[PDB]
């Protein structure tokens, strides 16, 4: 119901990630520390 959809300071909202969010990107043989690095999210249409 729309009644319990208010927001006051203190609530958490698990929102879908948008542009500018930080993610960890890695491949499998993490032989060194550059095989697992942080990127910024950009939302592009296709599924890759």
């Amino acid at each position: 119901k729309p009644s319990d959809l208010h927001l006051q300071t203190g609530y958490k909202v698990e929102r879908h990630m948008c542009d500018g969010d930080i993610v960890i990107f890695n491949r499998q043989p993490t032989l060194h520390k550059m095989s697992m690095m942080g990127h910024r999210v950009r939302i592009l249409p296709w599924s890759t």
Binding site: S3, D4, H6, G10
Partner: protein, 506 residues
């Protein structure tokens, strides 16, 4: 098929066997547009009566098979377990399975156990008596008699008693259903006449034969199809609206803050007042002589207006301002022009009484209150009215009289004093932000969260989880008086309507 009722019953009975508290169903504040001080029973009032007596209520058993009455969270937030026990419908009694479920539940949770159905008599009493006979080894006679004496009427369905005695005693010894309150088997078709003053010759009409007749005649005179008060209802004003007020040569009058009352003049001593709550009051010594025959008296006449309190220093004098007339001697004057009806008031009501007021045949110091008419003016002079005491302006179109809501009767009344009804649960913060920081939360109708907050004071803790009249001023809700028998707030829609008025006033 056939009806139940809710308004006149007691909120609770006496505890049974020191364990069970029989109750009628609490209602949510979602219904506060339908009920008020006298007939509002609300979960906070229950938990609060218990807190004031330092009593915990353990488990509350709901037998109504519905969730439209109140919010179970209002009970569960106080540490009281809530159980909705579905019972057999179709008017039948709780089955042996229902009784076993009730017994299994209640043998778990000194603290009371609240049991309620829509009314708190038949299902509640049946289950309580079954528990007494099985769990507490009572005799069924003792259980039935004790519930009848604790809950004031008690069980009143004959088949209920017959089944109780069949299960736990001798069915041939089952008592007949008790004679019900003759006075309560009656709301099938306010007690104070004027607030703050005591008025002679005015006594409320509760006599069942004549009450319905007076209400019926008012209905038929107004052409009112629905049930309830048939008088015209002015509405809020706030928009680009004063030009609408000068569209159908509306007349203006100052609005004194008074009590709406239609007056039906049906005969010699038949003078009656009807308020917005359809309550009827008989007035004795008010005389309305026929204009043509000063000896004869008026019949089939309906008026409309307010009862106002005038102050002649040292004492308050009641006054009845007649600001419209609906019917006169069965002539539909209400269908005529508003000026025609104003002249009808002046010439056919005030003047015939005022002739005998100078003859000594009518003594104004004998009559219950002063009867006058409300002056009306054009809007050109309303502007001067903005340049006895008025809390605003009324704005009346010149068309024919219309019952019910009139979108075209505009109320323009200085506000700056807009209270709201508010359930005050004081909560001291403990948890995430554990601070002293104990703030009083105000609640409204059909709205689960608090509607606002109020600053806690020494005085305010007195009425906690109670109902507490709170004016709005200085960007804060300010307590003014406790609504000592209303249970919790006004509906959220009503509260939002009030706030819409305060922020966009007229």
């Amino acid at each position: 098929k056939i009806p139940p009722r809710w308004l006149n019953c007691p909120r609770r009975g006496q505890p049974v066997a020191g364990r069970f508290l029989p109750l009628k169903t609490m209602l949510g504040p979602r219904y506060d547009s339908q009920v008020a001080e006298e007939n509002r029973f609300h979960p906070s009032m229950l938990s609060n009566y218990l807190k004031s007596l330092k009593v915990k209520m353990g488990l509350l058993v709901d037998l109504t098979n519905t969730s439209r009455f109140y919010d179970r969270n209002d009970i569960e937030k106080e540490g009281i377990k809530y159980i909705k026990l579905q019972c057999k419908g179709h008017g039948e009694c709780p089955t042996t399975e229902n009784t076993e479920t009730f017994i299994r539940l209640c043998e778990r949770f000194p603290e009371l156990i609240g049991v309620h159905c829509t009314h708190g008599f038949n299902r509640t009493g049946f289950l309580i008596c079954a528990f007494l006979v099985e769990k507490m080894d009572w005799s069924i006679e003792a259980a039935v008699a004790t519930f009848a004496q604790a809950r004031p009427p008690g069980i009143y369905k004959g088949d209920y008693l017959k089944e109780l005695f069949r299960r736990y005693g001798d069915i041939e010894e089952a008592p007949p259903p008790p004679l019900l309150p003759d006075w309560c088997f009656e709301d099938d078709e306010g007690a104070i006449f004027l607030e703050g003053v005591t008025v002679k010759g005015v006594t409320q009409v509760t006599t069942q034969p004549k009450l319905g007749e007076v209400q019926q005649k008012c209905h038929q005179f107004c052409g009112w199809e629905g049930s309830g008060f048939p008088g015209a209802q002015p509405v809020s004003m706030d928009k680009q609206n004063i030009k609408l007020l000068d569209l159908k040569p509306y007349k203006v009058s100052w609005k004194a803050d008074g009590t709406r009352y239609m007056m039906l003049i049906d005969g010699t001593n038949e003078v009656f007042m009807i308020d917005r709550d359809n309550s009827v009051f008989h007035v004795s010594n008010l005389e309305f002589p026929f204009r043509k025959d000063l000896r004869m008296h008026l019949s089939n006449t309906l008026l409309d207006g307010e009862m106002i309190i005038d102050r002649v220093n040292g004492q308050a004098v009641p006054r009845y301002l007649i600001y419209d007339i609906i019917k006169f001697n069965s002539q539909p004057v209400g269908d005529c022009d508003f000026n025609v009806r104003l002249q009808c008031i002046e010439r056919e009501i005030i003047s015939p009484r005022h002739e005998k007021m100078k003859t000594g045949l009518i003594d104004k110091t004998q009559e219950p209150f002063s009867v006058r008419n409300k002056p009306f003016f054009d809007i050109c002079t309303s502007r001067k009215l903005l340049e006895h005491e008025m809390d605003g302006l009324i704005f009346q179109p010149t068309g024919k009289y219309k019952p019910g809501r009139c979108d075209d009767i505009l109320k323009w009344k200085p506000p700056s004093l807009n209270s709201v009804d508010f359930r005050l649960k004081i909560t001291r913060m403990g948890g995430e932000g554990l601070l002293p920081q104990n703030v009083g939360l105000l609640y409204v109708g059909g709205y689960e969260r608090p509607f606002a907050q109020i600053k806690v004071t020494k005085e305010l803790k007195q009425y906690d989880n109670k109902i507490i009249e709170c004016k709005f001023e200085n960007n804060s809700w300010v307590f003014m008086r406790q609504r000592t028998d209303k249970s919790f707030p006004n509906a959220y829609n009503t509260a939002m309507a009030v706030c819409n008025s305060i922020s966009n006033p007229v």
